[PDB]
Each structure stands twice: as C-alpha cells, then as structure tokens.
C-alpha cells in the first residue's frame, strides 16, 4: 500500500542483508541499481546490474552502502561479486542536492567525501530504533554463545548483564525469561528502578567487584573499560564473559586470558546469526526514510 | 549498615505512607520531630510527637512534607491529628543553609516560601526513579479497576495502553503477563521498536482512531487529549477507558459520557491501593538523598 | 459444527445458563426451556414450557444449573416465580443415550440418574472446565489479594499450595505479576514442574517451615493443611486465601484466635467474571453435545 | 545435611554425567567403588578406582550404571577407560537382597539379568521428574538447533509445538518466552485448555495439515507418525522441523527430504548440550532415592 515509485536508488555492495533491502525496495517499485552482485542470481525483477562508473549519479536520489561502509582506501565490501568496488569523491559530486547516503556505522573517509560533496549521510546504526530492533538478533546471538561455551543450562544459572541501554534491556529481559537468575548493573537511579520493576536484581556498577565474585555468565553492554583488572581479580575461571560492547569492548582481555577466564568479544552478532532479520530491519527503516525524501519532491 | 545518625529531621504531617518513611529513618537512627500525629496510636524509636512551634528549626537538616504539601493558606494535611497544622514562612527562615525540604507534587505556596527562604525544595514525584517504582502500585490499581468494571476476564481480552513512558511500559508489560492481547500506541520510533521487542503490538498514535475501534479496555498514559471526540466517535460502549494521565487526563469525558462510554480518571492510585508500598518507595529514595546531605558536613 | 437434529431441555439456571442457551441456539439445536417464564426475551428455536410438558422420550440431553438441585429435588431457577422439581420419572421416560449435564456434586441427582440408568456428567469435575475456570479464578484471587492488603503483589512473598489444575494457573500468574512465588506440592513431578517454571518448590511436609514469613498464602488443596500447628508459626502479617471447596483447607476458627485474616472464596469465576464463566460452560457443552450427536 | 554415610555403592562406567553423580554421592559421604575411570585425570573423596572383579558385591547396597546401561553382550559404556568393562549375571547374584540397580533407559540384557538375579532395577528416564527436569536442558538444545539452522530470529516467527506432554510444556513455554508466536497441537480437551491458559494458540492434531501451512519452525514431541506425507505435502521448503521424539521420531524424513524440507532428529540433547546439568539432574534424583534405601535397609 505504501510506494516508492519515482525514486531511483543505487545499492552499492553488501551481504545477505542487502538482499532484504533490495527485495523491499523492488516490492515498493523503486528504480534500482545494483553494484557488487554480478555473480548472484538474486531473482530480483527489474533491477539493473552494473559497475560504479556506469551508474547515472545525476538522477540518483539515494545511495545505500553496506553496514560497515568503506575501508581506508574506500573500497566497498561485496560478497556476490569478484570485481573490487571503490567509492570515490567524484561519484558523490555527480549527485543531486537532495541525495541522501545511508550506511551502518561511522567512517572518517565516508564522512569526509560526504561533507565535501555537501550530501547528507545517515548513520543507521546510530538511530534508536535500529539499535533496539537489532538487540533482538543480538540476544539470540548471545544465547547461542552461552549455550555453546558452557556445559550447563542457562536456566537456573547466575547471570549478570552490565548496563541497561537499548540492548542491555533486551539481554536482561530475555535471559530472565529463559529462566536464569538475572542481575543487572547500572548507574542511573532510573535504570535501577526499572531493573527492579522488571523483576530482576539491581546493583550499582561501583559494586561490580562484589556482584560478579560468583556468577556463571557475565554479559557486557558498557562501551568502556568496566571489567578491569581489579574486578577480574575477584572472579574464578567458572565465569564466561560475553562482551558485546564495540571494540575494544569492555574487558581487560589479556588479564582474563592469564587468569584462565574465557572472555569473548563478539562483534556483529545480528549479521552473523540472523541476516534475514538483520536485513529486514534495515529494509524497514530505510523504506520509512526514503518515503519522506519522496514526499518532499 | 548504611546509617543516618548525625541528622536532625522534621516530619510534618502525612498519610499512612509517611508511616513507612519515619519507619526507615528511625531504623537509620535519625533524630526526628513528628507534628500532625497526636491521634496515632503509637510512637517510633528516636522521634518525639510535638507542635511545629516546638521544633528547633535552627538545627533541622531536612523537612519532610506530605505528597501534596500544602493547601493555599499554609495548612499541612494531617490524617493523624485533630489539631490544624499550618507551615509558615518564618519556619523555613529559622533553618540552616543546607536544609532540604522534601515533598511530592508541586504546590504554589510551598515553592514561594521555600525559594523566598533561600532553601532547596525537592519535589520527589518529578524524579524518574520515583515515577518508575510508583508505576508498579499503579498497575495493581489499574488491574483492580479493570476487574471490577468488567464482566469478562482480562486474560484473552483486547487491551490498548497509550504511551510507553515510564509508567506505560509497566502497564503494558503487566497486562501482557496476565494474558490480555496488548497493543500499545506511541509516537517515537524507539518506543515503537521497543513495543515490538517486548512482544506487544505497536501502533502510531496518529492511527489511534483505527486501533481502538474494537478493544475491551483502553488504558491511557499520555498527558494530552488524544481520546478526543473524533477517536471516541468510532469506539463502542463496550469499551472501558481507564485514564491515568494527570488532571485533566487524556480524554473528552463529557463526550464519552454522551456516547455511553465508561471512561474513568484515576488519580493517586499508589496512595489508594498500596499505601505501604507507596510509602516504602518514598522512604527508600528519601534515605538515599539524606545520606548525600549527611555526606556534605 | 451444528446441533441441527438435537432435542435439548435446559432446566433452571442463572446468568450462565443464558450464555449456554445463546450458544446452543446459535447451533440450531431444538431447545425446551423450563424455569424461564419470568424472562422476557426468547431464544431462536426454543419453546418455554413446564417440566410436565416436555417429550422426554425424545430428549437427547438435559442441562441443569451449576448447583444441580436441593435434597427435595427442586431445581434452582432465577428466571421463574414458579417452583420446578426434577423427579425419577422424568429421567426414566428419557432415552438410553440421553446425558444429564450438571456442574457440581449432588446426592439426590446422582441417585435418580443412577436409578434411571442415565449418564450424569458433572462438568466442574472435568479437567478442561477446571483449567478454563482457573483463569477467572486467578483474577478473583488477585482481586482479593489487592483489596485485602496495603502492599503490592510485586515483590511480595507468595505461597501457593498444590500444583493441581488451578494451582498451576495461580502460581504462573502470580509470578508473572512479579511476586516471589514458592509452591508446595508432594509428588516429585509437581516439584520438578515448579522448578522448571522458575519458581521455588517445597514439599508440603515442610509446610510449617515455609510459611513462617510469607505475605499471602493461597490454598488449592482440598484437605486440611493450614492447621492449628502450622498456623501457630505464621503471624497476622500473613493473609490466607483458601480457594478449596468447603470446608476448605484451613482451621479458620484458629486463624481467628491468632488474628490471621483467612478467607474462604467459593465460586469466584461466577462472581468475578460471569460472562466468561458462562462461555466456558457454553463452549464445552457444545463440544460435548456434538459428540452425542455423532453417534445417532 | 541429608547424608549417605553408611552406604556402599558401585559406580560402573559412564559419561561426564557420571562425574556429577559421583561428586554428589561423595559429598554425601557414601562409600564408592568406581569402575570405568582409570583414565580420569583426578579422583574423588571416599571412592576408589578399581576393576569390576575387585568390587565386593556381596556388600554393595547399590549399583549405578550409565544412561544407556549396557550392550547385548553386557559391555558397559566407558568414556574414561581403555579397558573393556563387562557386567556378568554372577556379579548381581553375589549382591545382597535389598540391593537396587540404577540405569537410564531400558535395555534387555540388563533387564534380563536383573530379573533373573531377583534384584530391583530402576530405569530413571521412565520417571516423571527426570523427564521434566530434562525438558529444560532439552529446550536449550532445541533453541540452539533453531538458531543454528535459520537465517531469521526466533522472536517474531511462527512456531508450532506438537504435544503438551512433559517436554512439550517446557518447549512451548520457552519458545513463547523467546518471543515467537507459538501454536501448539494436542488432542486432549485438558491440554488444549492448558495451552489456552498459557496464553498460546491451541489446535487439535486432527487439524495438523491446516495449522502448519505457514510455520517457520515445527517442533514435534509426539512419539507417533504425525508429521506424515499428507501433512508434509501442504508444507513449504521454508519450514524447519525439529523432531525431539525417540527414534524414529514422528516424521517421514524420507518424504521431507524429497520435498526440500529440512527435518532433524535430535537424540539425547541434555547429554550433548548441558552434561553438567544432565548429571546434576540425575544425581539429585539418585540422592533422594538412595536415601529411601538407607532408611529401609
Ligand atoms: N556485538 C554486537 O553485534 C552488538 C550489537 C548491538 C550493540 N553493540 C554494542 O554494544 C554497546 C551497547 O550499546 P547499546 O546499543 O545497548 O546502547 P546504549 O543505550 O548506549 O547502551 C549503553 C548503556 O550503558 C550505560 N553505561 C555506560 N557507562 C556506564 C557505567 N560506567 N556504569 C553503568 N552503566 C553505564 C549507559 O547508561 P547511562 O545513562 O547510565 O550512562 C547506557 O545506557 C555499543 O557499543 C554497541 O555498539 C554490539
Ligand atoms: N493516577 C496515578 O496512579 C498516576 C501515577 C503515576 C503517573 N501518573 C500520570 O501518568 C502520566 C504518565 O507519565 P509517566 O510518569 O508514566 O511517564 P511519562 O514519561 O511522562 O509518559 C508520557 C509518555 O507519553 C508520550 N507522549 C506524550 N505526548 C504524546 C502525544 N501527544 N502523542 C503520543 N504520545 C505522547 C511520551 O513519549 P515521547 O517521549 O515521544 O514524547 C512519553 O513517553 C503522567 O501524566 C502522570 O501524571 C498518574
Ligand atoms: N472457590 C473457587 O472459586 C474455586 C475455583 C476453582 C476450583 N476450586 C476448588 O479448589 C480445589 C482445586 O483443585 P483443582 O481444580 O486445582 O484441581 P486438582 O487437580 O484437584 O488440584 C489439587 C491438587 O492438590 C494436590 N494435593 C491434594 N492433597 C495434597 C496434599 N495433602 N499435599 C500436597 N498436595 C496435595 C494434588 O496433587 P497430588 O498429585 O500430589 O495428589 C492436586 O494436584 C478443588 O477443591 C476445587 O473444587 C475453587
Ligand atoms: N531428543 C531428546 O533430547 C529427548 C529428550 C526428552 C524426550 N525425548 C523424547 O520425546 C518424547 C517426548 O515425550 P515427553 O517426555 O515429553 O513426555 P510425554 O508426556 O509422553 O509427551 C508426549 C505427549 O504427547 C501426547 N501425545 C501422544 N501421542 C499423541 C498423538 N498421537 N497425538 C497428539 N498428541 C499425542 C501425549 O498426550 P496424550 O495424553 O493425549 O496421549 C503426551 O502428553 C519421548 O518419546 C522422548 O523419548 C527426546
Ligand atoms: Cl541519578
Ligand atoms: Cl522519532
Ligand atoms: Cl512420587
């Protein structure tokens, strides 16, 4: 019922997730340009496969890069093409004023050539809805890791979730629902109250030492050094640390290794564990945002 | 072990709720002056019953007032006293610099005489943690209200909760727990996304009309008149509206009435339904805040 | 699902029976309605008559109210100024396959049905009714819990006695409401189940030790266990909601002497949620009545 | 407090599971003869490692065998032994009257030589509480399988669980807690009601074909040919079938493979997925039962 006819999009690069986007945009009758897909028989009606120097940027209303957009040299990551794909300044200049670029995470090079071309760059992984929606595949990732790195059942174990942010809330809820005894560490009184209303056990992150002495699994959400040497000193090798924070994560890895503590940094859970879902999530937010651009012209 | 020894505090007036407050402060060995409690059948450890004119204000580190501090002319509300208790400007002036006045909701008279006295006034109900803790007693209230004004079972019914704010989140989780088919309406994309992670049905409040056409119970949270004449026009008399938003609520009651719709505004639900717990919440936050004041000197 | 070729007598009843008649007319059963003269709306394909005016020879089922009848055999109508008595001969004129449905147990009814060689189903005794009914019964228990305490169900200490049909529902619901629930049973399988549901299990032999410091004790066991020696550990702080059938599972006269509020709550579904209660009945009957029709 | 002090027990072969069992019995100060573990890197307090011919059976109060007790020729499975342990009739014959033998599942050889020795044989897996305790580690195994065999999230999918028996209950409950949309098929009036009170969608299995047309995941718990060719012909390749029932499950796996449908048989999930919990579950039941033998004598 909601359409995107009279828009012209370039999908440059991607993985299993971009397929969901492409699927979505063709359902919404956008005019689609595909670069980085020459190998795959996607089965996507109407879509036109070409290189980056054969895209008519003059007419392009939007560019959809992959989640981790570009390397140093600015090469776009493809998985369904052998030909290396590179995004240049010049490409973004040939582009209308109202043209918006979409990517997942930050990148000095992409922010550069976008500020330089005076074109808007939306960093999806920074919106709340994307983080929140993405917490779902990320719990499922976390559950998966815990199941396969322990000899015991999640149910009835002692589980700490560090931080009650957009994902922490989801991790703690789902772990509790799975039957674990879940405790949560936060700092704001608001988070501590919510924890208790959710029926969980709250501790302040100042007391992290005392509250992880004897826990079975410790899941970190805090994008900072919280699982410091002083705190790991109190832990036993009975504890699995699943650290979900963005690199360099939240835990003194060298020290843990020393103490015989398995501490895993697990970047990119959604893409790894549920690409159809991870993909549908971006596709849906993207279809909402593109629609707004279209209503204005 | 967390104590409150070197502390002078007046507790002036109160409900059943205040009984919990005194209880905690006296467990914590504070020095207390109780006015408005002559009619109470017992005492507390460390506190005297006296008059406002009897208290040594020059030394008081904190004053505690009822949820609803004062009525115009300075009268403090008392449930446990025959004698009318009036708080004067002169009282607060006699007070040292660091002294904190605690209350619940806003009140013109109190704010005046306090700012005038150059003394800090903390209205506890504007804090997030209070609001979040209180949402629990308030669902219980709302559950109560739903059981009595319906001849059907909450379980398996259609319930809308409007708003995923501090309390709305608790109302939604709880009616879901209890077996209703809960949809929740909100405006922000993060709310919309969280409503889905919690396994509920989200809608945008711009669709309010369409999503309340056929529901059994519509619990409102939003401080704005969203249940307006035009939304109600296509609701049926079969709907119960339970309005928890503060005066003036969220609904065109007058119209609902004509339409044959039971819409009920339900203020101060924590106070009515679980006075002990309502009181225990205030006490617990009050404790924390006084430990801070005690730490400055 | 149609009861097209089925003659059914509904005799006496309350709001709930109306619900059944509704559903049974929806399915185009031929209904005979006795003890409903004081009612002013009718029912499609239903004839209001006297008990002595029904062709019992052709009735395939007979439906009585929840509390079947008195010792003298008079059915409890709410919808008639006139007194209706069910006799042995009514049931003898009835065909071999005719089923009498009622709710609870009754000596007179069991006797006349047995002497008539006629199947008497007591619905409140069947698992599904017990289970469907457990829902409106928690809500009732919740209700009582809310109005009889000054504290919140959330974060309280709750004990539920018996993981039977209703107790199962009573525990999951209270736990989901954020109460700390522990449940006493006796069989190992019940204790396993309690453990899986994430709740704290104890054995009813340990009952004195496990109810010292609870806030609400909810009872489901139809046998005396909240007794004088147990009760003597508990303190007036504790609230007992005994849901078991009369006499209950509590030494109430003792709870009295100790100052413990202990309530007997019979017939919660009918009180808390009459529309639902009647639908539960209605729906099972319709499922059951089709089974009868499936043979002839 | 519950001690097994005056008791002589032989533990003959077994898994990592048996370690938890031994750990428990030794903690209860039983006297243990441990055969099948020469190759374990540590020992236990109060138990000697030995050979079956070294066991003083004439005094053994009880013999504890592996989950799958024994082969046809009488060999006992040992994962911690080079040497081949074989259990003879003569061994049970030497044993005293009250002596009880414990094993996991059924098996003829054992069954036979017990009966012929006139000695009590308890098969643990046939117990209600074992079955239910094990359901927990088994859902987690199932969750794992779901996660590893799909490219989408469990949250928000269509899940069908077949049967509400001892494990079906746990399975249906836990996938629902994961945020799936769970329907469950049973046949008793009583199970159907239970399902509905559980807040899930019930159906009768007579209707299976109808209800699995659009499911993402189908979990069978029924030890009968239910997921048959005629049912399977309605399904689409998109569906994943997890068959948890004992070999040969409830599926036409040969038809399912032809139709392009992945269907898995997943035997002994507790053992694979959480051996510590499997073991502990077994020990706590064993401990409780050996206490009955001790009381009797
Ligand atoms: N592994 C993956 O595939 C994956 C998936 C999703 C997210 N992530 C990463 O995981 C991290 C989690 O962030 P998020 O998306 O959940 O959003 P978020 O809302 O920012 O989560 C961070 C939370 O941690 C709290 N926090 C920060 N410092 C703290 C401290 N010292 N003590 C106690 N609490 C503290 C913050 O609360 P306050 O307001 O109290 O400071 C904030 O609520 C991010 O770095 C994100 O990139 C990774
Ligand atoms: N009687 C009682 O038992 C009692 C007890 C506690 C609270 N209350 C009342 O309940 C209300 C709820 O407040 P709270 O403390 O729960 O938290 P809150 O944060 O104040 O909740 C309000 C929520 O409504 C949303 N909202 C506001 N205006 C909207 C609009 N015009 N359309 C759609 N959504 C809108 C907001 O979302 P955005 O952030 O997107 O704006 C916000 O999340 C307050 O009025 C409070 O006075 C009553
Ligand atoms: N007043 C109302 O509104 C209301 C509503 C519904 C039901 N009820 C009544 O409340 C009772 C509830 O029974 P129900 O329908 O839930 O089904 P139920 O299956 O009878 O529940 C009873 C459970 O209690 C257990 N039990 C009996 N004696 C025990 C003992 N001495 N120690 C430990 N456990 C014991 C049984 O377990 P075992 O397997 O160990 O024997 C059984 O599982 C019935 O009497 C019913 O009439 C009242
Ligand atoms: N792979 C593993 O790790 C693992 C783990 C545990 C169990 N299992 C296997 O899975 C099966 C599960 O049984 P369980 O332990 O969960 O206990 P169970 O109580 O016997 O489960 C079977 C349930 O299915 C229902 N049922 C039986 N036949 C049916 C049919 N034809 N149509 C519809 N429903 C039917 C039964 O209800 P009714 O009363 O109507 O007959 C019963 O409640 C067992 O065979 C077991 O060996 C495997
Ligand atoms: Cl704060
Ligand atoms: Cl927004
Ligand atoms: Cl038993």
CA dist., res. D259 & res. A12, Å (int): 36
Reading phi first (left if > 0) and then psi (alpha if -120 to 50, else beta), residue A289 is in alpha
Name the 3-class secondary structure at D281: helix
Residue D248: asked if its preceding bond is cis (omega within 30°), the reply is yes
Q: What's the DSSP call for residue D138?
A: H
CA-closest candidate to residue D242, choices D266, D275, D223: D266
DSSP string, chain C: ---TT-EEEEESB-HHHHHHHHHHHHTT-EEEEES-TT--S--TTEEEE-GGGS-GGG-SEEE--SS-B-TT-EE-BSS-SS-EE--HHHHHSS-TT-EEEESS--HHHHHHHHHHT-EEEEGGGSHHHHHHHHHHHHHHHHHHHHHT-SS-STT-EEEEE--SHHHHHHHHHHHHTT-EEEEEESSHHHHHHHHHTT-EEEEGGGHHHHSTT-SEEEE--SS--B-HHHHTTS-TT-EEEE-SSTT-SB-HHHHHHHT--EEE---HHHHH-HHHHHHHHHHHHHHHHHHHHHH-
Report DSSP letters for D143-202, one per residue: HHHHHHT-SS-STT-EEEEE--SHHHHHHHHHHHHTT-EEEEEE-SHHHHHHHHHTTSEE
Any CB–CB contact under 8 A between D199 and chain B? yes
**CB proximity list for A113: less than 8 A, separation 6 or greater:** A74, A87, A88, A89, A92
Those residues with Cβ within 8 angstroms of residue B200's Cβ, 6 or more apart along the chain or in another chain: B172, B176, B182, B183, B184
Mark yes or no for CB contact B151/C273 under 8 Å. Answer: yes
Pairing assessment for the beta strands A201-204 and A181-186 based on DSSP bridges: parallel
* Structural determination approach: X-ray
Which class would CATH give C127-273?
alpha beta
Which are the contacts of D264, defined by CB distance < 8 A and separation ≥ 6?
D145, D149, D240, D241, D242, D243
What values do phi and psi take at B35, rounded to 5?
A: -110, 145
- Strand C61-63 relative to strand C46-49, pairing: unpaired
In D37-127, which ranges are continuous DSSP H helix? 89-94, 108-117
Cα–Cα–Cα angle for D124, D128, D130, nearest 5°?
Answer: 50
Judge whether A10 and A62 are in contact, CB under 8 Å: yes
Neighbouring CB atoms inside 10 A of A222's CB total: 23
Contacts of A192 (CB under 8 A, 6+ apart): A186, A202, A204, B129
Q: Rg of the Cα trace of chain D? A: 22
**D106-109 long-range Cβ contacts below 8 angstroms, 24+ apart:** D107/D68, D107/D69, D107/D70, D108/D72, D109/D69, D109/D70, D109/D71, D109/D72, D109/D73, D109/D74
CATH 3.40.50.720 range(s) for chain B read 1-127+275-297, 128-274
List the single best residue of B199, B201, B202 to mutate versus D (max D Cβ within 10 A).
B199
CATH no. of B128-274: 3.40.50.720
CA R_g for chain A = 22
How far apart CA D223 and CA C172 sit, in angstroms, is: 28
D245 in a known ligand binding site: yes
**Beta carbons of A178 and D178 less than 8 angstroms apart:** yes
Residue among C121, C153, C174, C156 at smallest CA distance from C287 = C121
CB atoms inside a 10 Å sphere around CB C103? 21
Shortest CA distance to A165 belongs to which of A146, A199, A138, A145?
A138
Residues, chain D, total? 297
d(CA A3, CA B206): 19
Looking at the DSSP bridge assignments, the partners of residue C75 are: C69, C84
Alpha-carbon span A252 to A241, nearest angstrom: 11
- How would DSSP label each residue in chain B? -----S-EEEEESB-HHHHHHHHHHHHTT-EEEEES-TTSS---TTEEE--GGGS-GGG-SEEE--SS--BTTTEEPBSS-SS-EE--HHHHHTS-TT-EEEESS--HHHHHHHHHTT--EEEGGGSHHHHHHHHHHHHHHHHHHHHHT-SS-STTSEEEEE--SHHHHHHHHHHHHTT-EEEEEESSHHHHHHHHHTT-EEEEGGGHHHHSTT-SEEEE--SS--B-HHHHTTS-TTPEEEE-SSTT-SB-HHHHHHHT-EEEE---HHHHH-HHHHHHHHHHHHHHHHHHHHHH-
Closest CA to D125 of D281, D295, D293: D281
Instruction: Find the CB nearest D153 among A137, A153, A154.
Output: A137
Proximal ligand: closest to the CA of A191: 1
Q: What is the CA radius of gyration of chain B?
A: 22
Sequence-distant (6+) residues with CB within 8 A of D227 are: D162, D208, D218, D220, D241, D243, D250, D251, D252, D256, D263
Task: Report the DSSP pairing between strands A85-86 and A75-76.
Answer: antiparallel
Cα(B141)–Cα(B182) distance, integer angstroms:
18
Torsion of the alpha carbons at B47, B48, B53 and B59, rounded to the nearest 10: -40
B156 in contact with chain D, both atoms CB, cutoff 8 A: yes
Give the right CATH number for C1-126+274-296 from 3.30.1180.20, 3.40.50.720, 3.20.20.140, 3.40.640.10. 3.40.50.720
Under 8 Å between Cβ of D249 and D220: yes
Yes or no: say if A4 and A290 are a contact pair by the CB < 8 Å rule: yes
Q: Which residues partner with B183 through β-bridges?
A: B160, B201
Q: Which of B206, B247, B204, B242 is nearest to B224 (CA)?
A: B247
Residue D124 DSSP code: G
Residues A162 and A249: their CA atoms lie apart, in Å, by: 12
d(CA B295, CA C6): 82
Which residues of chain A make contact with B193, given a CB cutoff of 8 A? 128-129, 132-133
Question: What b/e string do you get for D241-259 counting C-beta neighbours within 10 Å, with b at 16 or more?
Answer: bbbbbeeebbbbbebbeee
Task: Give ∠ CA D126-D127-D132 in degrees, rounded to 5.
Answer: 110
* Number of helices followed by number of strands (H, E) in chain A: 11, 14
Element (H, E) at A20: helix A16-27
- Partners of D179 on chain B (C-beta within 8 Å) are 197, 199
Alpha-carbon distance of C274 to D39, in angstroms, equals 68
CA distance B166 to B132: 6
| Angstrom distance (rounded) from CA A135 to CA A175 | 13
Ligand 1 surroundings by CB, under 6 angstroms: A 131, 134, 138, 163-168, 186-188, 191, 205, 221-224, 226, 244-246, 266-270
- Domain span(s) for CATH 3.40.50.720 in chain C: 1-126+274-296, 127-273
Cβ atoms within 10 A of the Cβ of A276, count?
17
Asked if B173's CB is within 8 angstroms of A198's CB, the reply is yes
Residues of A in contact with C157 (CB under 8 A): none
Cβ-contact B35, B10 below 8 angstroms: yes
DSSP class of residue D55 equals: S
**Breaks following residues of chain D (C-to-N distance > 2.5 Å):** none
- In terms of DSSP bridges, do strands D100-103 and D85-86 run parallel, antiparallel, or are they unpaired? unpaired
The tally of CA atoms less than 13 A away on the side-chain side of residue B12 is 29
Contact B39/B14 with Cβ under 8 angstroms?
A: no
User: Rounded to an integer, what distance in angstroms lies between the CA atom of residue D183 and that of residue D160?
Assistant: 5
Which of chain D's residues have a Cβ under 8 Å away from the Cβ of A144? Answer: 144, 147-148
Side-chain-facing half-sphere of B62: CA atoms under 13 Å: 24
C188 lines ligand 3 (CB under 6 A): no
Q: Do B190 and A132 touch (CB under 8 A)?
A: yes
> Residue D132 and residue C192: Cβ atoms within 8 Å?
yes
**For chain D, where are the E strands, in sequence order?**
8-12, 31-35, 47-49, 62-64, 75-76, 85-86, 100-103, 120-123, 158-162, 181-186, 201-204, 217-220, 240-243, 262-265
Resolution in A: 2.8
B119 vs B114: CA distance, rounded Å: 5
**A153 touches C: beta carbon within 8 Å:** no
Q: Is C100 within 8 Å of C64 (Cβ atoms)?
A: yes
DSSP state of A78: B
Any binding-site annotation on D127?
no
CA contacts within 13 A on the Cβ side of A249: 18
Number of H helices and number of E strands within chain D? 11, 14
The CATH code for residues A1-127+275-297 is 3.40.50.720
What is the spatial distance between Cα C207 and Cα C249, in angstroms, rounded to a whole number?
A: 13
C296 with C61: CB under 8 angstroms? no
Task: Name the binding residues of B for NADP(+).
Answer: 166-167, 187, 205, 244-246, 266-269
Query: Which residues touch D77 (CB under 8 Å, ≥6 apart)?
Result: D13, D14, D66, D68, D70, D71
The radius of gyration of chain C's CA atoms, rounded to the nearest angstrom, is 22
Give the CA count within 13 Å in the CB-facing half-sphere of C166.
Answer: 27
- Cα torsion through A58, A62, A66, A72, rounded to 10: 50
């Amino acid at each position: 019922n909601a359409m995107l006819t009279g828009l012209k999009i370039a999908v440059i690069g991607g993985d299993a997730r971009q397929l969901e986007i492409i699927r979505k945009l063709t359902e919404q009758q956008a005019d689609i340009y595909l670069v980085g897909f020459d190998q795959l028989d996607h089965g996507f009606t109407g879509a036109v496969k070409c290189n980056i120097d054969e895209i008519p940027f003059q007419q392009i209303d939007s560019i959809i890069l992959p989640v981790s957009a570009t390397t140093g040299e600015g090469v776009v990551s493809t998985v369904f093409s052998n030909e290396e794909v590179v995004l240049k300044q010049d490409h973004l200049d040939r582009t209308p004023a109202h043209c918006v670029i979409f990517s997942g995470i930050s990148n000095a090079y992409l922010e550069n050539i976008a500020a330089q071309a005076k074109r808007k760059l939306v960093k999806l992984f920074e919106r709340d809805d994307i983080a929140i929606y993405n917490s779902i595949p990320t719990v499922e990732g976390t559950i998966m890791l815990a199941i396969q790195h322990t000899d015991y059942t999640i149910h009835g174990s002692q589980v700490a979730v560090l931080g009650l942010g957009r994902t922490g809330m989801t991790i703690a809820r789902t772990f509790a629902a799975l039957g674990a005894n879940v405790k949560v560490g936060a700092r704001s009184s608001a988070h501590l109250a919510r924890i208790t209303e959710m029926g969980l056990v709250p501790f302040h992150t100042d007391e992290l030492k005392e509250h992880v002495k004897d826990i079975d699994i410790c899941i970190n959400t805090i994008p900072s050094m919280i699982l410091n040497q002083t705190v790991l000193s109190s832990m036993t090798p009975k504890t699995l640390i699943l650290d979900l924070a963005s690199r360099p994560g939240g835990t003194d890895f060298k020290y843990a290794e020393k103490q015989g503590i398995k501490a895993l940094l697990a970047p990119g859970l959604p893409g790894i564990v549920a690409p159809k879902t991870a993909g549908q999530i971006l596709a849906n937010v993207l279809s909402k945002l593109l629609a707004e651009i279209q209503a204005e012209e």
